[PDB]
Ligand binder design. Structure first.
Ligand SMILES: NC(=O)c1ccc[n+]([C@@H]2O[C@H](COP(=O)([O-])OP(=O)(O)OC[C@H]3O[C@@H](n4cnc5c(N)ncnc54)[C@H](OP(=O)(O)O)[C@@H]3O)[C@@H](O)[C@H]2O)c1
Ligand SMILES: NC(=O)c1ccc[n+]([C@@H]2O[C@H](COP(=O)([O-])OP(=O)(O)OC[C@H]3O[C@@H](n4cnc5c(N)ncnc54)[C@H](OP(=O)(O)O)[C@@H]3O)[C@@H](O)[C@H]2O)c1
Ligand SMILES: O=P(O)(O)OC[C@H]1O[C@@H](O)[C@H](O)[C@@H](O)[C@@H]1O
Lengths: 484, 484, 484, 484
């Protein structure tokens, strides 16, 4: 017997919903990864029907002629109900239409909240008081952002946790659903090559890079509200840091992994204001199209704003394994390229017998694009040479696994929610630690309004970040020559 | 000022000379790697000329029409003198011919002995008493084999050492001149990734593989005399074992490296008779041409001989780093392929959290063919899967350094002799140790005449070697699937 | 301001109360370690008075004539109330009495349940329903034993946890109050000489020894119900194992330490019945007094009882640090001495160059008697010798800290309860793991009624225990000679 | 058959001879450690007899009334021969006299050189040309000092080595004869508790302490020539450093240990002049006897002498195990006490959770006086405390082996020479490295004549040495309180 499963999309008319969630679940249904008895009901304020959302989301489905029959099946399993985000009567109407399905009750309920944070409290309280299943399990899915600082996020976290247990809250951080972020755990805890060397005795510094080649591109209101720190460094870089620095769990269970992650987070001290470089981008006079406009050009930006579009922050995990090793979290929009990269720079080899010609090893795990694990090792120079040179032991997903499709992060996250695996989600304690690490710095920046170092659009950011990276021990040589 | 260097070929008419030496030195001179004032004198019993050896060695030079001018320069710097290996008059004739050359006096003689071992004593004593330069450095080069057992090799080694200083003997083991064998030092002494894990605490067993897809093909008299053990295991496999198991040298100097190599050799006990698997090949019923004949189907092989064409022997290096870890030296002619491979099977990951789906990691360093370093590591299965699968971090010479021509071993060895580097050459004491481990086993086999396990030509050798591999610790699963 | 503290003792007329708790609180008050406004309330079914319990507990105070004034103050701060363990009226009578003090409302109430396990239900429920302070904190204290198996302990733990939070439940395991047992953490996580070597890579086996030189001596009825396993191995030896094998906590907070302990408990597999040696003592024919009778020679012991007074059980902690290392928990009553010992036998030194004259090093931390930490180390033989003998690096409390007094465990435990430090107390999940490790073994023993190996009173128990110890990896030599 | 052995003491009338070598050989013969065919021949310029040497060396024998008969036996096996150190005729006369003894031809001759270094060249030349046994082995024993700098030591070492083989030259460093110095090898290579932590990953700095409570005491003419560096630092402290830092030998043979020691020597760079603190003691104005006079208050010391009687020198071993760890060699005469001590200060425990109360562990080995090995550990404060404090795991020889008399170093050195064990003797290459480490510093000090920091007699030397120790990483706290 296959239990009935139901997927609910809040704000089904929303941008995020029609842009990512509906294509994600359609792709998952195309591969048959959901249980056989799966229904989908949309919910928003807009008075739409299944046909309206269908024609709105079809261009994002990436469908081909071979899958019409499955497409009409999928939209025969879809539904929509209109209502408000605070009127209960809409929620009893939704529940009445909700039970009117096959097996509708024993069904395992599942809610996705693709809504602005300003309505999270009301939506979650109404779902708790009205849309709770009596037989199957109920799992609610919240979305980034989670508050603005320690207290603002803490009040929301306590409001949600007071309503649902920790096994029913699924905080989405879609980089945790990436292929390489998951592969971090298997590389760390399934290989003896990477076991003894994963400590402060060998690792000089850890660099987690996040770059984007475009700016806010005319949508500067929300970025002005938040900043690059709150957007990326608080969640994406910090989860990659937790996966990198976590201790070996007792098992592969979600609770053990999240306990290790929160234990690692608890060992991080406050972010000092002398370890942070902020940058804001201005238009490139020789750029193309959007490259000629800066962050002060976007009208969606109040005049004279100090919001930074780049940041390089050092974190220290004070524990027996990571004491003294800097964790350089450098992220920034409007940079020269797109790259999510985990770079562990190892210490110099003890007793260099190669006359200072050797350089630091760098295990690099590029999350996106071109998923690949390569360790920058020192091999002997091929030919009639004896001095060593930097090479790599490369494993690229795209040259070794061409015939397999690395799925989208949302697909895997939703599949994990369906299967009950909560390993790749943010816990309340982990969120509290993540917010308390950065809250003093955010408050200091908000109250003081510093001047971020200007950096031209499309450049590699302010040089002050590079000065910081050199200062905190990271060594950059620029002698690494790589050819595909 | 560049000192004159003279290359000397004993037995210049020999097969080894015309097939490997003259092409090697021609390639070295073609790239300008030899000193500008370089002359070459040939010596053998046959009364030949420069033109005769020229036309004999032309098919092996791999010459090109644009290289013709350099070819005539090369053969203008060549000369030939005939004589006897026992008559001194020929030796002072050669010396006088040398003195009639560009500053012969201050010239740096360099001797090569491409002769059968039966004349090494006489040739070396005559060279010492008649052919020594009074100004520049003098170095001789002796060739495999080095005796037959401990005492037979010891007498020759003492005779040579009593005549020449250890900075003058250059014992050729051309597998030391291979690209990957020399790289072994860089891989482990220039990387912090391979340092902490290079011990008995992480390595379960070490396998050194040497395979040949072909048999002896009418040259079976010498192989019947020797046996695969003293052919390949005493020198090639054992030197790869020394380089794998050596300690970190104080410097890249030759003497230091040879010191740790002999130190590691001194920690190996002699071979027990219960750790040896021996095989003799018989023709394949459905073979092709040469494959239809066995080792006993060769007319020059004496009838009813028990000489084996395959050997898998387990060695133990009882020291603080290699105590208890087997060193399975598996070699065999008439096997299914050609491969020189160094395989380190690491221990099972402690506290397996992936439900025994992980398998032992293996750093594999394939010397030839298709030089490549790949660590068989456990990565997460790409796509909608969570169990790990075997993969590799691959660095291949040919896909990364396709424009770089990896030279022949003899080229690099002769260049090392010219440059005075003795790092990749056999010193007397590690030769004595290497013969010490294997001599009792060779004597026991010679006296007892065991029966080697018959294995079909072109097969993977006897299954008893695989049984030994399982018995001593090595784990084989056969689930590794690799695509280029 | 010093808040009022009230120490309420259930079963004030009890044996354990009068012989251990009243002397403990009197000693704590005599040294001035209690808050100034501290009062003690007695409670039991007996209609005793303050003077009655006073004269009953004088002989166990070890009081002195010069302390008469402080003793009079102590008993001026004492009180007693008679009542029932299930009648609520007595509970609000105690509440009204306790409130009728100085600050008898803002007081910090502290309860000790020195009662048989059969009344924990009623006492806990009545205390929760009637005897809570609305201003100060309220902490309850429970005592060994905790059930008989997994389910019996689970029901009691769930009932207690359903009424009190984990910061208000204080589970007493007086071996956690021992000096060496708490010093284990400082040995492990504060010294760099015991950190790198505290893993499976250097430890051959782990032995925790518990010995008593006397049998049940006339109380065999109580011991027959439980057995030595449930008496010692489930709590004392197992918590010693947890403190030995625990990973380094994030901080010295109680929650971190208990989380590490329960994490280590989660990694222990269930006890197989092939690693248990049960023993029942038989009367020594030439003993003195009590030694002439066996376990079956006691009137209150049921006839034909196969209860074991000795046990040696091997535990395996399947994790990264303790994979494969056996954990022999050897306990036994009527043995040859009284001794609680933590013995860590290290592996043989790899690459032994002393001609097998060396033996395994042993880290010993003797909890009692004569608290001492010594490492059975290999030093060179003093005098005109070159071979090593087995010696020790001894730190003995009594020769180094003679002038300081070693306090009783209950004293420091009660002081920790007063200070709110819950570091050395058992958590509920720790009980669940400690009981699930042993429950199938105890159930199978109870069902099958096996036959314990008889051993003479005053001997060292069955020799099958020694056979098991040598089988699982422990090497006993008997060559260790020690002189005081 | 017991081969005859002959003990020859060159300069038998010398100060060192009658103070140390005659009582040493007498003690060795008293205990029957010598072969029963043992004879002793003296030689010097003085025209003394057996009775004269007897009456001169009796007070230093420490004889007792019960061993006269042993004294008459010993002096019946004693003989004296007069002659010169450059006249051959005396040497053939000695050869004739010493052959004219039982088995005076197969006897194993063994020579001791208790002579000033100015005559070593002539004495070794004559003894090689005239007094060599043609049947039994011959071993020559030399004494400190070995030259004054690199070239002065090299010339004498080459002269000695050009006449005798390395298995016959026995260079005396009587500290290598000390109990603790030899025991260092058993500490390191026979214990699993001191092996893993014996590297740069756990050791912060190394201090080798040598202190003397008395000045030059009227022998300033000899000490002015050399200085404290050449006196103790070049040999005693540095050989202790070599034996502490050495890699584990392949076997307990002498050549393996000596090779490891010279390998460690080869990894040390020349001594820079910015890490050397020199001190010259001056008279304490309130001293007693010799404490009231300084090094300038001794008539035989040349006026205006800048020779240093104290030195703290920082050494680095650039190898895989000791990279970055400073080696502080702090030695000085006229200090506050007498002490030879090996102190290894370990790094701070990473991720300290005890709020900076922990301090660096210090493995301390006191060579003399009161031989003891103790590791300064951090244990919990006994009693009603929870903070850790400094303690030690103490093994003191005098409390554990009080009935075992630790023999003099010269006794064991002579017994080693008799037995052929050359483990504890200095090699020529060892001397070369030891001298090239310090030679540039000594030459610079001689050429520029610095001014050492004055320090009063009986003090702990200049405070600049303490400043240097603090700067190079050593953390002195002064809070370590020890009670016997
Ligand atoms: N692939 C290889 O052949 C190979 C590989 C590695 C090592 N080696 C070693 O290198 C050496 C080169 O010899 P080879 O392989 O080229 O075989 P080879 O042709 O039989 O010997 C080479 C030359 O040595 C002379 N020679 C042969 N037999 C002799 C004998 N009984 N007495 C005196 N001189 C004799 C001959 O000089 P003349 O022509 O003037 O008469 C012959 O031309 C051999 O020792 C071989 O073991 C060979
Ligand atoms: N406690 C120590 O003094 C001590 C400790 C360790 C090492 N050493 C070393 O051991 C060696 C023994 O010397 P020592 O301490 O006993 O002092 P020493 O008395 O001056 O030298 C002992 C012998 O040296 C001879 N001698 C004296 N002056 C000489 C000169 N100009 N030329 C040649 N020979 C001369 C004398 O031979 P005659 O009596 O026959 O004339 C005397 O017997 C010295 O090199 C010293 O560095 C000494
Ligand atoms: O501790 P010991 O054995 O007395 O060593 C001290 C002596 O050792 C010698 O090497 C020095 O030359 C002397 O100056 C010093 O007094």
């Amino acid at each position: 017997q296959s239990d009935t499963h139901i997927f609910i999309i809040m704000g089904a008319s929303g941008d995020l919903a029609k842009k990512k969630i509906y294509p994600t679940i359609w792709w998952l249904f195309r591969d048959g990864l959901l249980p056989e008895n799966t229904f989908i009901v949309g919910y928003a304020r807009s008075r739409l029907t299944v046909a309206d959302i269908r024609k709105q989301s079809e261009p994002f489905f990436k469908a081909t002629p071979e899958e019409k029959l499955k497409l009409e099946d999928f939209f025969a399993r879809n539904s929509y109900v209109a209502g408000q985000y605070d009127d209960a009567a809409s929620y009893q109407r939704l529940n009445s239409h909700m039970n009117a399905l096959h097996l509708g009750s024993q069904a395992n309920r599942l809610f996705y909240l693709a809504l602005p944070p300003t309505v999270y409290e009301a939506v979650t309280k109404n779902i708790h008081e009205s849309c709770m299943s009596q037989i199957g399990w109920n799992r609610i899915i919240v979305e980034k952002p989670f508050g603005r600082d320690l207290q603002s996020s803490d009040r929301l976290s306590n409001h949600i946790s007071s309503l649902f247990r920790e096994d029913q809250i699924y905080r989405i951080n879609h980089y945790l659903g990436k292929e390489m972020v998951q592969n971090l755990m298997v590389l760390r805890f399934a290989n003896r090559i990477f076991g003894p060397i994963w400590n402060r005795d060998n690792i000089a510094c850890v660099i987690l890079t996040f770059k984007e080649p475009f700016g806010t591109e005319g949508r500067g209101g929300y970025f002005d509200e938040f900043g690059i720190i709150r957007d990326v460094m608080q969640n994406h870089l910090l989860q990659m840091l937790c996966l990198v620095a976590m201790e070996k769990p007792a098992s592969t269970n979600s609770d053990d992994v999240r306990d290790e992650k929160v234990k690692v987070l608890k060992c991080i001290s406050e972010v000092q204001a002398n370890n942070v470089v902020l940058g804001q981008y201005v238009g490139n006079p020789d750029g193309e199209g959007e490259a000629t406009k800066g962050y002060l050009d976007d009208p969606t930006v109040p005049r004279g704003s100090t919001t930074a579009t780049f940041a390089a922050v050092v974190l220290y995990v004070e524990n027996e394994r990571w004491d003294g090793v800097p964790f350089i979290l450098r992220c920034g929009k409007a940079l020269n390229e797109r790259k999510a990269e985990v770079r562990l720079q190892f210490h110099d080899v003890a007793g260099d017998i190669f006359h200072q010609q050797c350089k630091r090893n760098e295990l690099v795990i590029r999350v996106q694009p071109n998923e690949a694990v390569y360790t920058k090792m020192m091999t002997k120079k091929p030919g009639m040479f004896f001095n060593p040179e930097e090479s790599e032991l490369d494993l690229t997903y795209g040259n070794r696994y061409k015939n397999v499709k690395l799925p989208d992060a949302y697909e895997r996250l939703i599949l994990d929610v369906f299967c009950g695996s909560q390993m790749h989600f943010v816990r309340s304690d982990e969120l509290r630690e993540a917010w308390r690490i950065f809250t003093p710095l955010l408050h200091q920046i908000e109250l003081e309004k510093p001047k971020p170092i200007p950096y031209i659009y499309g450049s590699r950011g302010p040089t002050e970040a590079d000065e910081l990276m050199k200062r905190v021990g990271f060594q950059y040589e620029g002698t690494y020559k790589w050819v595909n």
